[PDB]
C-alpha cells in the first residue's frame, strides 16, 4: 500500500496540477503515457467530483483509460497529451478569482469532461481535408464540424463500454443538462466558430456586471455557456501562453502534424493548406501570425473579462510573441 518510486516521482510532479505550466510532458513519461488518466483522476479527487456525483472510482479509472486509449498515439499533436493539457488548463481557468463561486458542480464537471473528450479519435487531419477526401467522417456529419461532432460521439459512446458509465448515478435531469453543456462546449472548439465566439465574448466584457466583489454575474444559460465555451476554447488555444519550453514542444508537434497533412495534400495534387507546406512555410512567422490574429485577441479579451487575474498569462504570451518575432531571418 506504499507507492513505487516512479509513482512517487509522478505524485510530486502532480503537485503542480493547479499551476499554469505544469510539466505535462514529464507527467506523460512518468505515468507510462497516461497523462490524461492521471491528471483527470487528480482533478476529480481535488474538486471532490467522485463524491458529489457518486462516481465509483473503478468506473472512473476504467472510462479514463478507455478514453485515453481512443486518442491516437501516432498523431503528433492531437493526442492524449494535448487532451491532458487542455483539461489541466481548464482546471486552472475555472479556479480564477473572478469566477469564484460562479459555476455549479455540474457546470464544472461539464467543462472538465468536455475538455477531456474534446479531441478524442482525432486522425491528425483537418475538417477541410476530411471533406475534400470524401472521408467517411465527413459524410457521416454532412460536412458540418465533422471532427468535433465525432469527438463528442466517441466520448459519449465510450460510456457504454464495460464498467465505463461514470454518470450512472446522475439523475436524468442532471444528465440531460450535462450532455447539452458538453455538446455546446465541444462544438465551440471548431475554429470556424472562433470569430463569433470572440465577438460574443467582447460584447459580454462591454456589458459586464459583477457582484461587487469583483466576481462575474452570469444569470442566464446563454451567458454561463458562453463563458464556459470561451474558457475551454482559451485552454485549447493556450499553447503560446505557456513557458517557452512547453510552447516549443507544442509548436514542433503541430508542425509535424500539419506537415504530414501537407505531404498527403501534395501527393494527391490538392491545394496545400496554410502552414502545411514543409518547403514554403516558416515556423516562426506562422506562430507570430497565430498569436497576432487568433491567440492574442482571444486572450486579451479573456484577460479583460477576468481582470486582473490573467495578466501573467497575457505577459507570457507577449514575451513569447517577441521571442518568436526576434528569430525571424
Ligand atoms: C502551437 O501552435 C499551434 C497550435 C494549434 C493550432 C491550431 N490551428 N488551427 C487553425 C489552423 C488554421 N488557422 C490559421 O492559419 C489562422 N491564421 C491566420 O489567418 C493568420 C495566421 C494564422 O494562424 C487557424 C487555426 C486549428 O484549427 C487547430 C485545431 C483547434 C484549435 C487550434 C489548432 C495552430 C498552431 O500554430 C499555428
Ligand atoms: Mg479539436
Ligand atoms: Zn484541441
Across the strands, what pairs with 210?
216
How big is the CA angle at 176 (ends 173 and 179), to the nearest 5 degrees? 145
Alpha helices in the chain (DSSP H): 5-14, 24-30, 35-46, 49-53, 57-69, 80-94, 105-117, 127-132, 136-140, 146-157, 172-187, 194-206, 221-236, 244-267, 283-290, 296-305, 311-326
Q: Which residues, 6 or more positions from 38, have their beta carbon under 8 angstroms from its beta carbon? A: 10, 14, 27, 31
Name the one residue in this structure whose C-alpha cell is 472510482.
57
- Give yes or no for a contact between 205 and 305, defined as CB atoms under 8 angstroms apart: yes
Hey, what's the cell of 224? 454561463
Distance between Cα 38 and ligand 3 center (Å): 18
| Residue the block writes with cell 459524410 | 139
Residue nearest to atom 24 of ligand 1 (CA): 191
Residue 270 DSSP SS3: coil
Q: Helices 105-117 and 146-157 sit at what angle, rounded to 10 degrees? A: 110
Q: Tell me the CA–centroid distance for residue 290 and ligand 1, in Å.
A: 6
Cis omega (within 30 of 0) on the bond before 308?
yes
Inter-residue long-range contacts of 88-91, CB under 8 Å, 24+ positions, other chains counted: 88/17, 88/22, 88/24, 88/39, 88/43, 89/20, 89/115, 89/234, 89/235, 89/238, 90/115, 90/231, 90/232, 90/235, 91/17, 91/18, 91/43, 91/115
Distance 190 CA to ligand 2 centre (A): 6
From atom 20 of ligand 1, which residue's Cα is the shortest distance away?
289
Given 41, 70, 78, 296, the catalytic residue: 78
The protein residue with its alpha carbon nearest to ligand 1, atom 21, reads 289
- Grid coordinates of 83: 487532451
Domain ranges of the chain: 1-329
- Beta-carbon contacts of 5 under 8 Å, excluding residues fewer than 6 positions away, are none
119 annotated among ligand-binding-site residues: yes
Nearest Cα residue to atom 9 of ligand 1: 191
Pocket probe for ligand 1: among 76, 287, 290, 316, the residue whose CB has the most ligand atoms within 8 Å is: 290
Q: Is 118 annotated as a binding residue?
A: yes
Q: How far apart are CA 46 and CA 318, in angstroms?
A: 31
**Is 78 annotated as catalytic?**
yes
**How far lies 120's CA from each of 51, 85, 171, 172, 259, in Å?**
26, 13, 26, 25, 21
User: Experimentally, how was this structure solved?
Assistant: X-ray
Determine if residue 292 is labeled as part of a ligand binding site. no
For residue 81, the ligand closest to its alpha carbon is 3
Q: 121 — phi, psi (to 5°)?
A: 60, 35
Residue with cell 505557456: 242
CA separation, residue 168 to residues 34, 107, 313 (Å): 24, 17, 38
> How far does the centroid of ligand 2 lie from the alpha carbon of residue 5, in Å?
35
Q: How far is the CA of 289 from the centre of ligand 1 (A)?
A: 9
**Is there a contact between 190 and 127 (Cβ–Cβ < 8 Å)?**
yes
Ligand nearest to the CA of 115: 3
Ligand nearest to the CA of 186: 2
CA 248/CA 242 separation, integer angstroms: 9
CA distance 237 to 302: 12
Output the DSSP codes for 9-52. Answer: HHHHHHTTTTSTT--HHHHHHHTTS-HHHHHHHHHHHHTTHHHH
Residue 269: other Cβ atoms inside 10 A:
7
Pocket of ligand 1 (CB under 6 A): 191, 236-237, 239, 250-251, 254, 274-275, 286-287, 289-290, 293-294
* CATH code linked to domain 1-329: 1.10.1300.10
Annotated ligand binding at 168? The verdict is no
| Best residue for ligand 1 mutational test, from 294, 299, 323 (most atoms within 8 Å of Cβ) | 294
Resolution of the entry in angstroms: 1.8
Counting from 1 in the atom list of ligand 1, the atom nearest the Cα of 247 is 1
Amino acid at each position: 500500500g506504499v507507492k513505487t518510486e516512479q509513482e512517487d516521482v509522478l505524485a510530486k510532479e502532480l503537485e503542480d496540477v493547479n499551476k499554469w505550466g505544469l510539466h505535462v510532458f514529464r507527467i506523460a513519461e512518468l505515468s507510462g503515457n497516461r497523462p490524461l488518466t492521471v491528471i483527470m483522476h487528480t482533478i476529480f479527487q481535488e474538486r471532490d467530483l467522485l463524491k458529489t456525483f457518486k462516481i465509483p472510482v473503478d468506473t472512473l479509472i476504467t472510462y479514463l483509460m478507455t478514453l485515453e486509449d481512443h486518442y491516437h498515439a501516432d498523431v503528433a499533436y492531437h493526442n492524449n497529451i494535448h487532451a491532458a493539457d487542455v483539461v489541466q488548463s481548464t482546471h486552472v481557468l475555472l479556479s480564477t478569482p473572478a469566477l469564484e463561486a460562479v459555476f455549479t458542480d455540474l457546470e464544472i464537471l461539464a467543462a472538465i469532461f468536455a475538455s477531456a473528450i474534446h479531441d478524442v479519435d482525432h486522425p491528425g487531419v483537418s475538417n477541410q481535408f476530411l471533406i475534400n477526401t470524401n472521408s467517411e467522417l465527413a459524410l457521416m456529419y454532412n460536412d458540418s464540424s465533422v471532427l468535433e461532432n465525432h469527438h463528442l460521439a466517441v466520448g459519449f459512446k465510450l460510456l457504454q463500454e464495460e464498467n465505463c458509465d461514470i454518470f450512472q448515478n446522475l439523475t436524468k435531469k442532471q444528465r440531460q443538462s450535462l450532455r447539452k453543456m458538453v455538446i455546446d462546449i465541444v462544438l465551440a472548439t471548431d475554429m470556424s466558430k472562433h470569430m463569433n465566439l470572440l465577438a460574443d465574448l467582447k460584447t459580454m466584457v462591454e456589458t459586464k456586471k459583477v457582484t461587487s466583489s469583483g466576481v462575474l454575474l452570469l444569470d442566464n444559460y446563454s451567458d454561463r455557456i458562453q463563458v464556459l465555451q470561451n474558457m475551454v476554447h482559451c485552454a485549447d488555444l493556450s499553447n503560446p501562453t505557456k513557458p517557452l519550453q512547453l510552447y516549443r514542444q507544442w509548436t514542433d508537434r503541430i508542425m509535424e502534424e500539419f506537415f504530414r497533412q501537407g505531404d498527403r495534400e501534395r501527393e494527391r495534387g490538392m491545394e496545400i493548406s496554410p502552414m502545411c507546406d514543409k518547403h514554403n512555410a516558416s515556423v516562426e512567422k506562422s506562430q507570430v501570425g497565430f498569436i497576432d490574429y487568433i491567440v492574442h485577441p482571444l486572450w486579451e479579451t479573456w484577460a479583460d473579462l477576468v481582470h486582473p487575474d490573467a495578466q501573467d498569462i497575457l505577459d507570457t504570451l507577449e514575451d513569447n510573441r517577441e521571442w518568436y518575432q526576434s528569430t525571424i531571418p
